[PDB]
Design a protein around this ligand. Structure first.
Ligand SMILES: [Zn+2]
Lengths: 81, 106, 16, 95, 117, 102, 80
């Protein structure tokens, strides 16, 4: 699979920003907010695949996900402590 | 007849498990007897204030069962939790219903 | 109302 | 083995102590379990740290306090210190 | 008729009682001294005022608290470090709004987005 | 004579109405399958042929939504800072700058 | 108290000058002093709490960087 970053339709990025409370959206946002994602997910997924392979596991675990979020300062609740 | 340490301390949170956690947690060479009691005492409090605020949210949203939207309203309406757990994002919470004043119609 | 008299520019009890 | 260990019935009973009429769904309950686990680790870690700074070797109820007052913001703090002190007072009174 | 008292003295006379030269343009010197306070390494809050600050501000938490000499110096340095980072963030949020001059509203937004308001 | 005109909510009315509706929804926004794929292509050069638990994606998406919405309120504040209602790419660059990750 | 105005206006300019700031509003200084004090009571509340933990009645540079450590920032050359 390649370039699935587009899978998040602008319709969606806007729904999120709408969730954020903004009114108007600039046109060249969509490449950039998505960029805030490619880089954010790549470092998140790097920490997650680090825990994955270190824990002898071949399946990326939701545990490993919330574990990596606990490390980088963007922790998550509701998926085990 | 063996009585639990929680009923000795007058708590519902269990001293036994949290002692077994404090020990396996290896926080210090020796853990004393009163440290898990005090630990369970504080955890039940912070589990209670948060549950009582969630219950107020559920009453205001007129629901008979706690949903994490009520938990999010509980943690975000209280400003003290907002720098206790403003570091924290929770599951299925949403955001506070806030609109900036300049975005309102004239 | 000011803290000084408007006539003599001195402090005191004033009628505002 | 199979046994997985969490604060389900305990938070349920303190909920009934607060509100003996209100339900809970399982994923909000996992929110509560992960939340009490996280605040437990913060309070216990700070305590461990305090001790290692003071060249001590044991986690006295004192450390957990210096800690609870060091971590939790103030409002929650003084009430947490009050309830923890009366809890350990009850523990030593009942031996 | 509204009245007010300002003398605040029941009686008067309280004292007599038994009980051609060059001028650089507005803005010219500032960059010369940006560089002076940037190449320099001293601490920019006077030690006696800041020492007195830490003494007067710490007294309410615990009575008779003594400070190691190095302790207030760690505070001095930490505070200057805290403020120079906040002021870089200020200058950034000020240059955002097509401006060179800052205004407090810059730094309440700078603190709000950093998550301490 | 009198020609019709359609009933169109004005620019901003529809905006604020879906703002109130979305700030009451807790449901995730970015769709599930589109997001799941977002990950499987990123987790390629790190290591091939991973498997993922039936929770990790959900955790990583809702987590991404939380990060993005939290970026979006202070993006809104940065847009209001220049007395504007339009957000711009500079706003989120400044946001990420002042969080300390630009 | 009296020392909060002791953090003087040129000193705040010097912090701003070290911070690369060219023009400064007149209303910067007093609320900047306020931001300074909120930061000070936070850090010294943590530092003093560390101090009466140690059965001590003086705070140390070690306890300061220790409070800073909790708060997140670290200082060097002041112990630790
Ligand atoms: Zn007069």
């Amino acid at each position: 699979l390649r370039d699935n970053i587009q899978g998040i339709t602008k319709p969606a990025i806007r729904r999120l920003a709408r969730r954020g409370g903004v009114k108007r959206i600039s046109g060249l946002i969509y490449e950039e907010t998505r960029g805030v994602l490619k880089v954010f997910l790549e470092n998140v997924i790097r920490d997650a695949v680090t825990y994955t392979e270190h824990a002898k596991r071949k399946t990326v675990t939701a545990m490993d996900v919330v574990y990596a979020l606990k490390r980088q300062g963007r922790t998550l609740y509701g998926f085990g402590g | 007849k063996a009585k639990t340490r929680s009923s000795r301390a007058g708590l519902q949170f269990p001293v036994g498990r949290v002692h077994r956690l404090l020990r396996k947690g290896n926080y210090a060479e020796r853990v004393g007897a009163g440290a898990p009691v005090y630990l369970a005492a504080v955890l039940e409090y912070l589990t209670a204030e948060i549950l009582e605020l969630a219950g107020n949210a559920a009453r205001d949203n007129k629901k008979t069962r706690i949903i994490p939207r009520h938990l999010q309203l509980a943690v975000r309406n209280d400003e003290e939790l907002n720098k206790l757990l403003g570091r924290v994002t929770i599951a299925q919470g949403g955001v506070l219903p806030n609109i900036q004043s300049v975005l309102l119609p004239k | 109302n000011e803290d000084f008299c408007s006539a003599c520019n001195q402090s005191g009890s004033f009628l505002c | 083995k199979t046994r997985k260990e969490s604060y389900a019935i305990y938070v349920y009973k303190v909920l009934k102590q607060v509100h003996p009429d209100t339900g809970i769904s399982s994923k909000a309950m996992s929110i509560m379990n992960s939340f009490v686990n996280d605040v437990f680790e913060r309070i216990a870690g700070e305590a461990s740290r305090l001790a290692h700074y003071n060249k001590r070797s044991t986690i006295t109820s004192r450390e957990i306090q210096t800690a609870v007052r060091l971590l939790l913001p103030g409002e929650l703090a003084k009430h947490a210190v009050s309830e923890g002190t009366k809890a350990v007072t009850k523990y030593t009174s009942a031996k | 008729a509204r009245t007010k008292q300002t003398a605040r003295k029941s009686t008067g006379g309280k004292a007599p009682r038994k009980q051609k030269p060059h001028r650089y343009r507005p803005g010219t010197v500032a960059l010369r001294e940006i560089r002076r306070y940037q190449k320099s390494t001293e601490l920019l809050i006077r030690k006696l005022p800041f020492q007195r600050l830490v003494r007067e501000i710490a007294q309410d938490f615990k009575t008779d608290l003594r400070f190691q000499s190095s302790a207030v110096m760690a505070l001095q340095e930490a505070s200057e470090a805290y403020l120079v980072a906040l002021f870089e963030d200020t200058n950034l949020a000020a240059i955002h709004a097509k401006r060179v001059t800052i205004m407090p509203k810059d730094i309440q937004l700078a603190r709000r987005i950093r998550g301490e308001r």
